[PDB]
Write a protein that binds this ligand. Sequence first.
Ligand SMILES: O=P(O)(O)O[C@@H]1[C@H](O)[C@H](O)[C@@H](OP(=O)(O)O)[C@H](OP(=O)(O)O)[C@H]1O
Length: 364
Amino acid sequence: NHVIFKKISRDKSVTIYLGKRDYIDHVERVEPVDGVVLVDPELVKGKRVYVSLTCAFRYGQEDGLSFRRDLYFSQVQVFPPVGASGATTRLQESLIKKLGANTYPFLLTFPDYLPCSVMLQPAPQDVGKSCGVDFEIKAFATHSTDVEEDKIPKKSSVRLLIRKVQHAPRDMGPQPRAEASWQFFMSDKPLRLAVSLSKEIYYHGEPIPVTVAVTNSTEKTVKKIKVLVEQVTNVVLYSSDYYIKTVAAEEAQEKVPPNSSLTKTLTLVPLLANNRERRGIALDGKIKHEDTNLASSTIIKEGIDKTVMGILVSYQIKVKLTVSGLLGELTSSEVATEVPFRLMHPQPEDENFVFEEFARQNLK
Ligand SMILES: O=P(O)(O)O[C@@H]1[C@H](O)[C@H](O)[C@@H](OP(=O)(O)O)[C@H](OP(=O)(O)O)[C@H]1O
């Protein structure tokens, strides 16, 4: 039982069928977009039907318009049939087998230098405007005029906004560890803090066990130990926007008295559903959609300029120590340290077809 997504143009002449709404990027390769286009012969007679894959960065309110920077464009012909227009994939030949003699296959690939689906809409107290990276699979019909000018009617076009989702690679970095120490004003003794995680890559919805070791040699009391998951977002194309937002939070029940040590392990789960406010964070889809999760960690391929990624997303554990009698008397700064990590989806890996609309389901 395989669900297949379809969309018909306004004039009923071109229909797209795709086997997936989200295509998988596991660093090594990127899943190609294979699908089929169903044409009405009488309506595409004398016309040519193409399918294009565009990836673009957008900044501003969409409609003059806003800011757009194209990052990858590819276009393929689907009608009339090109060469031995037999299927390339089992999905394609099964779809042609099911849909009939007017179905033509297409396959558009992703290069190895593109970002994944990332979008953001600012909050009231945020300065920058909404921005994102869109992936558009669009099939359209083209005809000519006796005044030597080709036309592309929107009514003969179908536009799909797919997602390029980031999945974990085969490898994984070293275990993330950090040690920080503070020597506060007028005190000889140091406050020390060691933080470790279990692994370097976590999956969306997987618990993160932050292990914390506070070594308090000072005369002061560590009033509180707070552990956070912070998402850091850098718009690196049109405006140099910057966001730090808290996605998970956990307080320790214990205090660390002067001249003692404490080792605890707190567990956090960074989830979009944790946050009632979905504005101001980096997502992989629109706020209105139930498909939407937090954006995955940006993975920059070696040799590629980070500005071509449009929006950079990173994640870090943050440990905040509230020390008694310090703030307001000995400092106006925070006592905290960071441990970076990466957040993705897990590693990857005749049918009967059920057809559904490509339009993504709203949240409500
Ligand atoms: O119909 P058009 O002119 O081609 O453009 C569509 C339109 O902007 C819809 O509002 C949008 O629905 P969403 O709110 O779900 O984004 C859809 O995205 P879609 O590809 O998911 O259908 C777009 O493609």
